[PDB]
Each structure stands twice: as structure tokens, then as C-alpha cells.
Amino acid sequence: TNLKADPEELFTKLEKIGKGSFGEVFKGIDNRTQKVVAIKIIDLEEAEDEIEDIQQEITVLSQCDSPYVTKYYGSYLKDTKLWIIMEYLGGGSALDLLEPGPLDETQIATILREILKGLDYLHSEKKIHRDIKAANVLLSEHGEVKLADFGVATPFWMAPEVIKQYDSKADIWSLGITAIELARGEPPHSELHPMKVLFLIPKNNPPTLEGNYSKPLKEFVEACLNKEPSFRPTAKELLKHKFILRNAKKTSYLTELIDAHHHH
Numbered sequence: 001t002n003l004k005a006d007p008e009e010l011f012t013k014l015e016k017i018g019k020g021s022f023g024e025v026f027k028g029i030d031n032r033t034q035k036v037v038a039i040k041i042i043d044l045e046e047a048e049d050e051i052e053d054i055q056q057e058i059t060v061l062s063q064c065d066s067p068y069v070t071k072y073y074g075s076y077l078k079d080t081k082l083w084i085i086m087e088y089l090g091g092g093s094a095l096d097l098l099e100p101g102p103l104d105e106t107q108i109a110t111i112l113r114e115i116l117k118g119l120d121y122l123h124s125e126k127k128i129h130r131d132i133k134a135a136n137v138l139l140s141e142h143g144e145v146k147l148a149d150f151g152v153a154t155p156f157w158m159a160p161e162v163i164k165q166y167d168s169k170a171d172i173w174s175l176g177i178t179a180i181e182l183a184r185g186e187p188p189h190s191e192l193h194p195m196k197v198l199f200l201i202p203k204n205n206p207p208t209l210e211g212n213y214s215k216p217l218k219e220f221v222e223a224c225l226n227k228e229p230s231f232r233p234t235a236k237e238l239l240k241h242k243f244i245l246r247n248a249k250k251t252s253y254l255t256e257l258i259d260a261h262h263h264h
């Protein structure tokens with residue numbers, strides 16, 4: 001973390017793009033390159049007991065070099081504020097893109113395929129994302145799909161073994177939930193109080209994808225959502241799952257989904 005440079009000279013802060021973990025996030029401009037960046041600003045006075053988790057996510061992101069993981073550019077300390085600079089992805093989150101209407105299975109498969117490419121990278125690197133969900137999947141304006149908002153090392157996407165206090169297979173369960181979310185708009189139990197979901201996930205049979213979806217998609221979900229982690233496939237194996245192979249297409253096609261969200 002750069003303690004000497006002034007981030008307010010280096011970056012032009014623009015509009016908020018939502019509330020993130022531990023701080024507010026803004027669209028911004030790198031004044032030297034004119035590239036758009038995402039800027040998270042954390043008040044270290046207000047968020048004292050969480051600084052350890054902040055440095056941990058900074059460390060993890062700095063160790064990632066993948067087309068499928070949002071790029072980290074650095075961080076700056078100015079007075080009491082920590083500025084964290086990331087790649088700006090103009091397509092929004094996958095969750096955002098659900099809003100105009102349902103995804104088709106080509107769009108679902110393409111997004112899941114790219115998520116799997118990111119999980120394959122992280123797991124090969126002995127990393128766990130820990131918070132796979134549609135809101136943490138970001139798209140570039142060209143349709144590229146990247147992971148963001150790693151979980152710290154809300155219950156709806158959590159694997160049962162995580163709740164009961166796991167390895168990379170936890171990400172595979174969360175991917176199954178995310179698959180349901182991309183198909184249906186929300187994860188299982190989304191109508192229920194989170195404290196109820198905390199005991200339902202360990203006690204109940206795993207969720208299934210309900211509705212008029214293709215059997216390969218239902219089987220993709222079922223394969224991820226096995227209570228037994230060792231019975232879940234790896235990200236590598238799921239990249240060859242028939243649902244992915246028969247339905248995923250070029251990521252550039254997702255610009256149609258991005259454009260639809262702007263006309264909505």
C-alpha cells in the first residue's frame with residue numbers, strides 16, 4: 001500500500017457505483033492514462049476491527065493474474081482513508097443483468113462457463129473464492145466475465161459444511177446456487193429469514209432447479225449441489241459438463257444482455 005502518493009491527484013473520483021464491502025465504491029479516472037477505474041474508499045477510523053480482513057483481500061487479489069479475476073491496481077492511504085483501485089467493469093454484475101427479464105440457457109451457460117474458468121484458476125492457485133454469487137460476478141462492456149468480492153476467510157449461497165464450520169468444493173456448491181439464481185432470479189429460500197436459512201441448508205436435502213429448464217441444466221445444478229463435497233465435481237470437470245458444452249457460446253454475445261439492461 002502506497003503511503004507517499006496522493007490518490008486525489010492520481011485519480012478523479014466520479015459517481016458512486018454502490019456500497020461494497022467495508023466502504024463506498026466509485027467510478028473514477030486514472031488521470032495519467034484516462035482509463036476508468038473502480039475506487040473503493042474505506043474510512044479506517046470507522047472500520048477498525050475489520051482492517052485485517054481488508055489486508056487479506058488485498059493480498060489475495062494482488063496474487064491473482066487471470067483474465068477471470070478483477071484486476072487489482074494498488075492502494076493508497078490518504079489521511080484516515082484507504083483508497084483501493086481496481087479494474088472498472090462497465091457491464092455491471094450478473095445480478096444486475098437479471099433485472100430486465102429471464103436469461104436464456106445460452107446466457108446462463110456462458111456465464112457459468114466463465115465463472116468456472118475463474119474457479120479453475122483460483123483452485124489451481126490453492127485459493128477459494130468463498131462468495132460465489134451473481135452479485136459478485138462482474139462483466140466488462142465487451143461481455144468478459146470476471147470474479148470480484150472474495151469472501152472473508154448472508155447465508156443463501158453458503159455450502160452446508162461452511163455453515164457448520166472446507167475446501168474448494170465449497171465454491172462448487174455456491175456455483176450450483178448461483179446457477180439456480182441465474183435461471184430463476186434468486187437463490188433457494190430467498191423468501192425466508194436468514195436465520196431460518198442457516199439451519200435449513202444443513203438439515204434439508206440440497207435445493208433443486210424447479211421449472212421448465214433443460215435436463216442438462218438441472219443436472220448441472222444437481223451435480224454442484226451434493227451435500228457430500230467429495231461428490232461434487234471439480235471446476236475443471238464441470239467445464240466439460242454437457243450443459244456447458246451444448247449451450248455456452250462466445251462471451252461477446254453477452255453484450256446483447258448488457259445493452260438490454262441499459263434500454264430497460
Ligand SMILES: CNc1ncc2cc(-c3ccc(-c4cccc(C(F)F)n4)cc3Cl)c(=O)n(C[C@H]3OC[C@H](N)CO3)c2n1
Pocket residue numbers: 017018019020021022023025038039040042053054055057058061070084085086087088089090091092093135136137138148149
Ligand atoms: C460495476 N463495475 C464495477 N467494476 C469494478 C468494481 C470493483 C469493485 C471492488 C471490489 C473489491 C475491492 C476490494 C479490494 C480489496 C479489499 C477489499 C475489501 F476489503 F474492502 N475490497 C475493491 C473494488 Cl474497487 C467494486 O466494488 N465494484 C462494485 C461492486 O461490484 C460487485 C458487487 N458485489 C458490489 O459492488 C466494481 N464495480
